[PDB]
Design an enzyme around this catalytic site. Structure first.
Site, PDB file in Angstrom:
ATOM      1  N   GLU A 214       0.845  -1.195   0.000  1.00 22.20           N
ATOM      2  CA  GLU A 214       0.000   0.000   0.000  1.00 22.20           C
ATOM      3  C   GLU A 214       0.879   1.244   0.000  1.00 22.20           C
ATOM      4  OE1 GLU A 214      -2.319   0.260   3.539  1.00 22.20           O
ATOM      5  OE2 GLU A 214      -3.256   2.144   2.921  1.00 22.20           O
ATOM      6  N   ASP A 216       0.444   5.025   0.509  1.00 26.98           N
ATOM      7  CA  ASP A 216      -0.510   6.070   0.877  1.00 26.98           C
ATOM      8  C   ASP A 216       0.051   7.408   0.422  1.00 26.98           C
ATOM      9  OD1 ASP A 216      -2.514   4.409   2.118  1.00 26.98           O
ATOM     10  OD2 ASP A 216      -1.243   4.337   3.894  1.00 26.98           O
ATOM     11  N   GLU A 219      -3.009  11.066   2.988  1.00 26.23           N
ATOM     12  CA  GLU A 219      -4.042  10.882   3.991  1.00 26.23           C
ATOM     13  C   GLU A 219      -4.083  12.190   4.739  1.00 26.23           C
ATOM     14  OE1 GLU A 219      -2.223   7.080   5.593  1.00 26.23           O
ATOM     15  OE2 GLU A 219      -4.381   6.646   5.843  1.00 26.23           O
ATOM     16  N   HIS A 230       3.844   1.576   2.716  1.00 23.62           N
ATOM     17  CA  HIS A 230       3.788   0.425   3.607  1.00 23.62           C
ATOM     18  C   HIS A 230       4.053  -0.801   2.725  1.00 23.62           C
ATOM     19  CE1 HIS A 230       0.930   2.279   6.748  1.00 23.62           C
ATOM     20  NE2 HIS A 230       0.719   3.076   5.718  1.00 23.62           N
TER      21      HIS A 230
END
Ligand SMILES: *[C@@H]1O[C@H](CO)[C@@H](O[C@@H]2O[C@H](CO)[C@@H](O)[C@H](O)[C@H]2NC(C)=O)[C@H](O)[C@H]1NC(C)=O
Ligand SMILES: O[C@@H]1[C@@H](O)[C@@H](O)OC[C@H]1O
Ligand SMILES: [Mg+2]
Length: 440
Positions: A214, A216, A219, A230
């Site tokens: 993942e 990101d 956010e 991640h």
């Protein structure tokens, strides 16, 4: 899960730009699809629900396979029921929507490819990805997220015999949290050991989670933002059980890195950089640019660095630098950064243990799906993004303060009760070689 036909499924359209050196971009016609967890799930022969509130119908769903064969995902009323609307290159996600038959809190969508059936697969190595965001209407406790995950292009249609719905119906979600609230994983209903949420009346968790790499990209809410790769020690969407899922006490024993290697300007010691009236002024729309640099400056080289630029009112704004006493100074995500920050903060370095940016780049090689969402947080009240976290730690301890929000902020019921009309607008998505997606 099966395909329901009570309601036609029409993915809201969204244009994206593919850009070239020099900055000329072509417009591509794409669309978005609602994640399967939000959908009406009913019997294949009729209209009887298989799941209501946070409870599965035991006689329709006696076991995971029978449930997947008996239960159909149907089409979605995107705007009137789910708060999802688009206007050209702009996607608006509303926080609370009251449809005629159901109320929905938050949403998660994926970008579809040109075929409007399979997800779009992004190959991010040595590319630059830009989007515009207006999060002026996203207060403490909210997260408007734009990110990539290593989902299958068909959402599992071809891997799983009892998944007959696939990406057209938003199946196949996974991320590095290995979420166990996902209703269908690997074409089977996740009903074993099903436990309703006490705080979220629409949610529960089953025995299995769904895990994958993942990235990101974004956010954030009006107060604070984070960019966080991640990684996992598995390739692609993978079902987990037990210790693999790294739930609770086994947080660092699992197959994925739950914490990630994050860069939140505030957490990294610059409290004046991003927020209302700050250098990046989140009271207004701005551009977020993210560059995924390889060691040899080719699309086949090793991912080495993730850099960030902002553009607001035509002015390019450099990323903030870290300001943590005792820690070397960085302005981007490198493996050195991650090692330095995890050491400075005393956080377990699972990101590096699980192979760091190299492994992130390998997920990019294979391809990742674009996700956009708006959500509140039943587990930690978004305090990890915008407040002091853990709330039981001294706020002078480096790494604890991530934003200006109160430690009492972000309780879902409070945020829903107080700011129901919150929303995020993601727009003007562009991908291309480094330098191509904005004007310097
Ligand atoms: C946080 O980052 C911002 C943006 O880089 C820095 O902004 C500077 O702030 C000083 C003090 O007000 C100004 O005189 C400069 O004009 C600002 N520069 C820019 C480009 O905006 C700020 O110094 C950083 N803060 C810390 C503590 O490192
Ligand atoms: O992705 C987030 C992670 O970085 C961590 O800090 O805990 C909350 C998660 O949602
Ligand atoms: Mg199948």
């Amino acid at each position: 899960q099966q395909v329901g036909t009570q309601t036609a499924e029409n993915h809201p359209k969204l244009t994206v730009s593919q850009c070239s050196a020099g900055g000329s971009c072509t417009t591509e016609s794409r669309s978005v699809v609602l994640d399967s967890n939000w959908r009406w799930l009913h019997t294949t022969s009729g209209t009887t629900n298989c799941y209501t509130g946070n409870t599965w119908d035991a006689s329709l769903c006696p076991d995971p396979v029978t449930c997947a064969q008996n239960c159909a995902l149907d089409g979605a009323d995107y705007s009137g029921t789910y708060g999802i609307s688009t206007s050209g290159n702009a996607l608006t996600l509303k926080f609370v929507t009251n449809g005629p038959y159901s109320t929905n809190i938050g949403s998660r969508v994926y970008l579809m490819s040109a075929d409007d059936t399979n997800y779009e697969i992004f190959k991010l190595k040595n590319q630059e990805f830009a989007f515009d965001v207006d999060m002026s209407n996203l207060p403490c406790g909210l997260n408007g997220a734009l990110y990539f995950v290593e989902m299958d292009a068909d959402g599992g249609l071809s891997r799983f015999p009892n998944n007959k719905a696939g990406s057209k119906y938003g199946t196949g979600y996974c991320d590095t949290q290995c979420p166990q609230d996902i209703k269908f994983i690997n074409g089977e209903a996740n009903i074993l050991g099903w436990t309703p949420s006490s705080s979220d009346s629409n949610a529960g968790t089953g025995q299995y989670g769904s895990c994958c790499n993942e990235m990101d990209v974004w956010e954030a809410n009006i107060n604070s933002a984070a960019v966080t790769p991640h990684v996992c020690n598995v390739q692609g969407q993978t079902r987990c059980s037990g210790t693999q899922c790294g739930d609770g006490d086994e947080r660092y024993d699992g197959i994925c890195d739950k914490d990630g290697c994050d860069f939140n300007s505030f957490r990294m010691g610059n409290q004046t950089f991003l927020g209302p009236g700050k250098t990046v002024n989140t009271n207004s729309k701005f551009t977020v640019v993210t560059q995924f640099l390889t060691s040899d400056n080719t699309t086949t080289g090793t991912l080495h660095e993730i850099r960030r630029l902002y553009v607001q009112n035509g002015k390019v704004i450099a990323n903030s630098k870290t300001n943590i006493a005792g820690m070397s100074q960085f302005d981007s995500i490198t493996d050195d950064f991650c090692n330095a920050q995890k050491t400075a903060f005393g956080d377990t370095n699972s990101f590096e243990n699980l192979g760091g940016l190299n492994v992130m780049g390998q997920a990019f090689d294979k391809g990742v799906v674009l996700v956009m969402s708006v959500w509140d947080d039943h587990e930690a009240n978004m305090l990890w993004l915008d407040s002091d976290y853990p709330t039981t730690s001294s706020a002078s301890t480096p790494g604890v303060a991530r934003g200006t929000c109160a430690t009492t902020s972000g309780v879902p019921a409070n945020v829903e009760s107080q700011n129901p009309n919150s929303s995020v607008v993601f727009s003007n998505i562009k991908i291309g070689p480094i330098g191509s997606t904005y004007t310097a």
